[PDB]
Amino acid sequence: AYTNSFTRGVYYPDKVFRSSVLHSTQDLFLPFFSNVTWFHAIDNPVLPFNDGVYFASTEKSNIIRGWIFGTTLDSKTQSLLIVNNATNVVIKVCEFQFCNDPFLGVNCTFEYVSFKNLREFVFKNIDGYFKIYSKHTPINLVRDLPQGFSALEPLVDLPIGINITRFQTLLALHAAYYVGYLQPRTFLLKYNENGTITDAVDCALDPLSET
Amino acid sequence: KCTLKSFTVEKGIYQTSNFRVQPTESIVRFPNITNLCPFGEVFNATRFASVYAWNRKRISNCVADYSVLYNSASFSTFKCYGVSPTKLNDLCFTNVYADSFVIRGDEVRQIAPGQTGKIADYNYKLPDDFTGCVIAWNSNNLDSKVGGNYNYLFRLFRKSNLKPFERDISTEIYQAGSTPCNGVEGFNCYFPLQSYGFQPTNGVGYQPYRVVVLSFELLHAPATVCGPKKSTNLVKNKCVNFNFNGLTGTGVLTESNKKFLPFQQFGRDIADTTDAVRDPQTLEILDITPCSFGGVSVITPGTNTSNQVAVLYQGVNCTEVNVFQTRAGCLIGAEHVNNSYECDIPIGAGICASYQTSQSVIAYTMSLGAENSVAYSNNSIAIPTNFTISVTTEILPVSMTKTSVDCTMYICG
Amino acid sequence: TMSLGAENSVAYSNNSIAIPTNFTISVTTEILPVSMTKTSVDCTMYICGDSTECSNLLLQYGSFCTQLNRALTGIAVEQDKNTQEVFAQVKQIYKTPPIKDFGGFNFSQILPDPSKPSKRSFIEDLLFNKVTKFNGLTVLPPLLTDEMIAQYTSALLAGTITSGWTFGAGAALQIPFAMQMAYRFNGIGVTQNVLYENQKLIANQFNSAIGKIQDSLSSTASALGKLQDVVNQNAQALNTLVKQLSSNFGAISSVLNDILSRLDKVEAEVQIDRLITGRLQSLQTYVTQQLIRAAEIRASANLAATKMSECVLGQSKRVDFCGKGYHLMSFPQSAPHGVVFLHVTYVPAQEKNFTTAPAICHDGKAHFPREGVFVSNGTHWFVTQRNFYEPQIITTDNTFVSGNCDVVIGIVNNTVYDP
Amino acid sequence: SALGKLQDVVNQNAQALNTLVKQLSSNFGAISSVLNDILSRLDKVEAEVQIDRLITGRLQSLQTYVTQQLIRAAEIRASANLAATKMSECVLGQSKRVDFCGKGYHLMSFPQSAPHGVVFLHVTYVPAQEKNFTTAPAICHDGKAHFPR
Ligand SMILES: *[C@@H]1O[C@H](CO)[C@@H](O)[C@H](O)[C@H]1NC(C)=O
Ligand SMILES: *[C@@H]1O[C@H](CO)[C@@H](O)[C@H](O)[C@H]1NC(C)=O
Ligand SMILES: *[C@@H]1O[C@H](CO)[C@@H](O)[C@H](O)[C@H]1NC(C)=O
Ligand SMILES: *[C@@H]1O[C@H](CO)[C@@H](O)[C@H](O)[C@H]1NC(C)=O
Ligand SMILES: *[C@@H]1O[C@H](CO)[C@@H](O)[C@H](O)[C@H]1NC(C)=O
Ligand SMILES: *[C@@H]1O[C@H](CO)[C@@H](O)[C@H](O)[C@H]1NC(C)=O
Ligand SMILES: *[C@@H]1O[C@H](CO)[C@@H](O)[C@H](O)[C@H]1NC(C)=O
């Protein structure tokens, strides 16, 4: 299944404050109105990672709780694993030997700890530095990812140096979710009076956006 | 007189070199972390890494002293890129990646940015734009052994050259032709690694050398590896020189309502200079405003008539420099007057100055002319009963001197 | 494909004339730039930002920095000269009497309003609403404040209303405003009885045309485009000069304090000379384009000063110099960085066709009109003033003789009256 | 000071040539501002590095001069076009244009030559001694309204 991404998937590009300004930047962004893959966990196959990922899920029930990343997923290299279970965060990179059908059951060079709603996330891995961004919002639409704009703040950067070409998501076992890929687009970002990114233009979308 | 390169000065207003408020104190701020950085875990380990499989050590959340390294007689080379070693103790970085390995004494030439050859292309690749230091020492007494120290390995072959910092540890057979290798050595099919096998009989070029490449994560992100420098109390509402985490500048600091989100560390201007900071010891946002500056104009009657003078600090406030405030700036040595006259020397915003009685420079709002109610009514006319013939002069420039310049004789003579 | 205009066969023949039987008083706005913002740049602080290390390298380049400050000082002094040459054309600050008995013409919307915090007219306040510093860059104030510019437009306007053109040639001489307007009608070749016989209509047409200026300015934000374009070009030039401080020009960083906090002197100088080279070229490109832009504003101020003299202090015979139609009069209003002229013109309105002749035969003598055209309603022949239909009996006193009927091509037989 | 517009054109052109000659003494980052000093001290490979810093800066110095002389020539041309118009309209004619040829009602003008310029002596009639009168737009007679010619 597929859906329109609309203007979703913008994030704060750098750790610098700006306000009441229009600012132009080139980075891995999800293009406006791009084509997003869609799944229903009541459905967690392995997917390619490309240059980076936008991920989102619908919420009323806490089914979806984590992710796996790597190249072969079979102990031949360090594989990033993330859990965020709605009370705790746990992160690991060991040479795990996952089975062909893993779930969260209801060498480790790094380790770390810390529908009514839509949860949004962005993952990117430039030179194996795994950066993460996210957002949450209430929603009115039961079926699908609604049209709107709200930028994602950074959460974490992992200095792990890991090559990723494949990834997967983890269900809790004894909901609608989404995947789309980032591209090296130029964007014009609007920073408001309170320094929030409140709107953007994808400069390659159409000739008016290029104008 | 020096600005005009003349001993006589005509009547007028002349700009002379600019005024700047000077920094009153120097302010220094760094994170209050106390850990000494773990560099001994790299430089003084008994074991060391093979160059085909170099070890990266993360350095973070600590106080360094890089001068302990470059003061030492121990190092056979100490190159630095994007930084000078002498200056590292004043800086602070988000992380250091200390990459570490053994190579032969000749191969130090391949441990540099943008290089080629067996070590650079098949073992350890530095980028075109590296920021860091490459530190090497002869380790014959640590890493040679009789019969050969075979514990140190290098990749002899690869099917394509590595990207910068691409840590390929694969032992899969190198294929030199169309011949299938079946995971074993054979015709056109070779193991990709070799061993240095170091012996104490080896010469200065074929001896083992230990290498550390300190690579600096230098970013807008918060810093965690700082040099050994002190930090001061903070200062506000005063022009000061300042340093936050190595970000050196000068200005008036104040508290501010700039609503930094918890991940932001600096604010930037249209010139990409910094216009706010977050302090590394308290989560408080400081606005930065430039120390006051302006042109300085000297207002003079001609030296043919007086040596008295008045001075205008353009756009400055008189609290920052008779003394009088105007929209043009702070005006000093001019007597303010409530009479109004033709504009003799122009100051700006309707203010002018002249030399008058007590013979001194005076400053006043200019008069546009005498004020005249014309005697209009619906039945009154004025008719001229006599005339005067005026002859008035007008002067117009028509040409200028016809210069020529042989640019080959101007440039090269 | 664009259309140039509606096609029109003019109804020409060798004996047909069209004479206008009525007129309209137009008031039309002209907007001219007169000055631009007086910027100044401390080129040492722009290029080197109070680094002493960069400051000593910038001395290797000699007098490039003082001649940039000399060029911008010449541009800045010229903006006050441009303003003085347009507005300071009065020698005295004239004022209107407290009784506005101008024969029914109503100047209240262009004369000063004392309720305002600066004494601008109502139309000068609309003009001031419809048009909109850290890196060694500064803005210097103009010599004449907007309050002083509004006193000059007030004096020019009050001299023109109370005394006509006389205050331009010498002392202001009072003349009743309808008698001054009767002179303006003689100046376009309309006989002055046409004003006195139509005075109440001409005043209503003028007062209505000033009401249309208020409505246009109180709605049409594109109207002052020439002044906003001059404001916009100077802002875009400064934003370009400031953003060029963020460029590397091939140095390791554009921030001069990165180089001076990361590198020792011998390696820092190699990086700083790239910043000096690119920033010096950035500032030379700005000053060169501000010199070319200043020359264009000076040409517009020289035109605005010539329109003040020839259109406000006089009445102009020059076609289309003081608006479209025959010029009667003009009024100046102040605007941000410029001047607005309200040009008052006579436009002919309602043609009728007539038969016409070059001359008339009477007693075999050829008679020609002294100051008019010979015209016919189809049966009778009349002499008319040339710019307004007012037919008079053909007489020895509105005609003159020369020779006899044998010579003139198209002469007509009609009686000429002897009083 | 009455001749100031012509002296200002002399002074600006003199100051531009003195600025252009002073810029020969600048190093632009070379070891010396003297070209024979570089060539008598250094061998060809190292001398050409120093000479190209002088060539770069002296070429920029001369481009700056010729650019501001082009901009100044356009101002002198505008003034000469105006002077040629005042010659035709006020020496060869009698102008009706207000304040084009002096204040007052223009009678006549005389050209006088001056260094790099022209001086016009403009002769004008100025009305000088007013008297006030009552006035009327028209006069009644036998019910006829009369207006002055
Ligand atoms: C996404 O791609 C599929 C084909 O892969 C196409 O049918 C669908 O219409 C596309 N949707 C959008 C939003 O472009
Ligand atoms: C989240 O994980 C922790 C262990 O990391 C566990 O103790 C906790 O109960 C989990 N919470 C939920 C809501 O599953
Ligand atoms: C750790 O590395 C060794 C080889 O050095 C490997 O055999 C082992 O499987 C790795 N650990 C895990 C958790 O796979
Ligand atoms: C900015 O934040 C303030 C509260 O700090 C709020 O009142 C205001 O409405 C916000 N403005 C915008 C444009 O979001
Ligand atoms: C040290 O810094 C932290 C914030 O980083 C702050 O909470 C603490 O009060 C500081 N203590 C001192 C003595 O500076
Ligand atoms: C110079 O000053 C003297 C008196 O000291 C005076 O006679 C002369 O006229 C002055 N000239 C000028 C040009 O000011
Ligand atoms: C000058 O500074 C004082 C504070 O010392 C302030 O009250 C005043 O408004 C300032 N005036 C100007 C024109 O800056």
Ligand SMILES: *[C@@H]1O[C@H](CO)[C@@H](O)[C@H](O)[C@H]1NC(C)=O
């Ligand atoms: C000018 O007049 C004002 C009152 O109008 C007065 O306050 C001020 O002190 C006077 N200045 C001088 C220099 O006398």
Ligand SMILES: *[C@@H]1O[C@H](CO)[C@@H](O)[C@H](O)[C@H]1NC(C)=O
């Ligand atoms: C004048 O006469 C011609 C006769 O053909 C006619 O076409 C034209 O419309 C007339 N114009 C006016 C203004 O009466």
Ligand SMILES: *[C@@H]1O[C@H](CO)[C@@H](O)[C@H](O)[C@H]1NC(C)=O
């Ligand atoms: C106009 O032309 C006609 C012929 O079409 C001729 O008979 C007549 O005399 C001419 N009239 C005038 C006034 O030229």
Ligand SMILES: *[C@@H]1O[C@H](CO)[C@@H](O)[C@H](O)[C@H]1NC(C)=O
């Ligand atoms: C004309 O009359 C007015 C009446 O107020 C008077 O002020 C003015 O001085 C008179 N002018 C002459 C020249 O008589």
